[PDB]
């Protein structure tokens, strides 16, 4: 079967830039190439077929040149919603084949995180566990550092952390750092705090609470 190799594997570009993904076939495929757009949590959308023809319904800012063995997909004026990974496909010979796709993320100005902390719920504690989650809301870039202190003592690998996909409108991230204990270990200590460091911050901001205080 014909191997499709896209490149780069991923790239970052500011809004309003022109972006260019390339796609090369191990064998000649004429102009029988298509480009798809896949946004996170979504099914692929068809953009271009026969190398260069725009699919009925897709914005004029998408285009695709190339013939024979080398093809390229272009986005003239990059927009935030264009955050996605793009796949090319050959259909000159069975079996039809895709590339590995390339992730396009949006580059933007720095935005500081908004920090929130939630103590363990009363209900959860009855179930024998206690999870305290720290929320970093709407920040850029992605590189952020969370640190958990309990009774002022630094923590090592007692919290799992999760981050969203770039927001389709503001190219922003959010992440949740969850410190999980047993109700047992939870009762023993008093002060719970998470310290967030970020480029957008002139100095580390920390949100803290004292256990069992209404």
């Amino acid at each position: 079967d014909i191997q499709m190799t896209q490149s780069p594997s991923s790239l970052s570009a500011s809004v309003g830039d022109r972006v260019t993904i390339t796609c090369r076939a191990s064998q000649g495929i004429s102009s029988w190439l298509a480009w798809y757009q896949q946004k996170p949590e979504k099914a692929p959308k068809s953009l271009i077929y026969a190398a260069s023809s725009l699919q009925s319904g897709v914005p004029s800012r998408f285009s695709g040149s190339g013939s024979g063995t080398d093809f390229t997909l272009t986005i003239s004026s990059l927009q935030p919603e264009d955050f996605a990974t793009y796949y090319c496909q050959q259909y000159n010979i069975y079996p039809y084949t895709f590339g590995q796709g390339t992730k396009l993320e949006i580059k933007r100005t720095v935005a500081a995180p908004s920090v929130f902390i939630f103590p363990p719920s009363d209900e959860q504690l009855k179930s024998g566990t206690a999870s305290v989650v720290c929320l970093l809301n709407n920040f850029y870039p992605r590189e952020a550092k969370v640190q958990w202190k309990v009774d002022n003592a630094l923590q090592s690998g007692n919290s799992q952390e999760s981050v969203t996909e770039q927001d389709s409108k503001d190219s922003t991230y959010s992440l949740s750092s969850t410190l999980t204990l047993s109700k047992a270990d939870y009762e023993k200590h008093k002060v719970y705090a998470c310290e967030v460091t970020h480029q957008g911050l002139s100095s580390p901001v920390t949100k803290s609470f004292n256990r069992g205080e209404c």
Binding site: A43, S114, F116, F118, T129, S162, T164
Partner: protein, 218 residues
């Protein structure tokens, strides 16, 4: 108008058989070919094959030749993808898509059917409230969806009425082998007490449907 609607996410144990469906409408079913594409978690797209609705004609890729079975039911304009014995390696998202005539690429896509093949027992989540905080500003509140298997779970706020500012984070796999995620929203502190916020958790596999009311503390 052209629509490809697929059956719901499947959770199966290895050795079991599986049949997922794709219902076409808004076009002449017999005039267009239908195909399937698998996408394993985090990885790319794999062309499974393509088939005619009208007669026998089918075309599989090598990797899938004799590993799956495509078919169609012209009478209910539905197409199918089918395994005789699932393996854990089969878990992945499966899309059905329509082939544009005179070409070979896919016109329109189904929304996909998540397929999870595993021996780990299904477990329904537990849902706890993340409660917020002269006055005024921004308040954050959410819902902690703990210890469930497998993925996915679903979180809407106020039955879908509350959309913007909502963040449901990617599930995290804990050492217990169970999944945990959190869903949160930011709102004006003004609304705390006046508007009432409810998160709607739905973990299909365990028929778990929980509406949890998140109200301020004390």
């Amino acid at each position: 108008e052209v629509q490809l609607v697929q059956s719901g996410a499947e959770v199966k144990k290895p050795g079991e058989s599986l049949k997922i469906s794709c219902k076409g409408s808004g076009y002449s079913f017999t005039t267009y070919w239908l195909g399937w594409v698998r996408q394993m978690p985090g990885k790319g797209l794999d062309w499974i094959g393509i088939m005619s609705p009208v007669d026998s004609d089918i075309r599989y890729s090598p990797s899938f030749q004799g590993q799956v079975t495509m078919s169609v039911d012209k009478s209910i304009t539905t197409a199918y993808l089918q395994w005789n014995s699932l393996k854990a390696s089969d878990t992945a998202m499966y899309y059905c898509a329509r082939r544009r005539p005179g070409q070979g690429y896919f016109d329109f896509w189904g929304q996909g059917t998540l397929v999870t093949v595993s021996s780990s027992s299904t477990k329904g989540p537990s849902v706890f409230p993340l409660a917020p905080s002269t006055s005024g500003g921004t308040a954050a509140l959410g819902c902690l969806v703990k210890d469930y298997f497998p993925e996915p779970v679903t979180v809407s706020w106020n039955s879908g009425a509350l959309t913007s500012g909502v963040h449901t984070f990617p599930a995290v796999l804990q050492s217990s082998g169970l999944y945990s995620l959190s869903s949160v929203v930011t709102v004006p502190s003004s609304s705390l007490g006046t508007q009432t916020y409810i998160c709607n958790v739905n973990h299909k596999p365990s028929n778990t449907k929980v509406d949890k009311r998140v109200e301020p503390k004390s």
